[PDB]
Design a protein around this ligand. Structure first.
Ligand SMILES: Nc1ncnc2c1ncn2[C@@H]1O[C@H](C[C@@H](N)CC[C@H](N)C(=O)O)[C@@H](O)[C@H]1O
Ligand SMILES: Nc1ncnc2c1ncn2[C@@H]1O[C@H](C[C@@H](N)CC[C@H](N)C(=O)O)[C@@H](O)[C@H]1O
Lengths: 157, 157
């Protein structure tokens, strides 16, 4: 009937130029496929901090936010989908019908539980990208994919 | 003995938030290794226009701009360097000493001449990225690679 694309991400307070771009893609998604952002609190890093405990804590909050959604992690070693392939996946997610949680890890990455829960995993790049740009890249690529499905003018290059 | 990184891009309109992001990274490159933008005016797609001819004209100009430089194309089918490899490429480019021209194609992509002129081709993603994001990604990823080489904090933030 409609499928929410929900970005579940660690971190807060992105640079304005980033927040602006991200918002520009976000507001162009149609009402029958809304794109939304859920931010998970980043664990307090520091000296003598237990990284592993923090990752686990972040993961548990992310899994709580995904609920019974399709879970797709953004991970460098995931599937290197090209744009036609992503359009196909979006169609797949539509047929599935469950809202989609797209998980983006914090500074230290995704918890093992999050990687285990993934139904699919998606690689944007072989590069190590900074979290804010990952947010913008997910918004645009999915928008482009959406447009291909609806024969919208943005994708015709 | 500084080495120049010249982004040779088919001239395009950049949204303000993209322009801000792009300059933010660009501004942080050392005098040791300058990051530079050189736009090539995009041809107009008139009625009945022969696309192939339009493209060649775009390319010839790119190559004229590249000159004697090492020519690296940004192309989806190119080498999907990870961030470690990109730092290693950066080191190779320095040993060369020769300036690098990094080519970004117009709406129709790179001219066959540009693709042929390439000593190396570099893929950011399997995805079809919009021209302005390609600029920001190149600036940030090259910055991250450089950061590694000098043990600058950015890479290890
Ligand atoms: N190439 C990529 N493809 C898909 N997801 C990515 C990619 N790079 C980073 N991510 C996501 O971004 C998250 C990690 C980023 N916060 C990495 C920044 C980290 N602080 C560092 O210094 O590089 C990872 O958990 C992934 O979920
Ligand atoms: N994933 C990528 N990796 C490297 N360069 C890219 C990538 N995506 C886009 N570009 C650059 O952006 C330019 C314009 C592209 N939108 C052209 C699209 C491409 N001709 C296609 O149909 O998939 C291309 O000529 C490339 O130089």
């Amino acid at each position: 009937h409609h499928v929410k694309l929900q970005l579940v991400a660690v971190g807060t307070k992105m640079p304005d130029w980033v927040q602006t771009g991200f918002t520009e893609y976000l507001r162009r998604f149609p009402k029958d496929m809304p794109f939304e952002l859920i931010e998970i609190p980043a664990g307090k890093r520091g000296k003598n901090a237990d990284i592993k405990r923090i990752l686990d804590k972040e993961g548990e909050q992310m899994l709580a936010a995904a609920g019974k959604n399709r879970i797709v992690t953004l991970d460098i070693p995931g599937k290197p989908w090209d744009t036609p392939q992503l359009a196909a996946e979006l169609e797949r997610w539509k047929l599935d019908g469950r809202d989609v949680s797209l998980l983006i890890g914090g500074p230290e990455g995704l918890s093992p539980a999050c990687k285990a829960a993934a139904e699919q995993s998606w690689s944007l790049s072989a590069l190590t990208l900074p979290h804010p740009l990952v947010r913008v890249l997910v918004a645009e690529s999915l928008y482009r994919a959406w447009s291909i499905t609806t024969n919208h003018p943005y994708h015709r290059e």
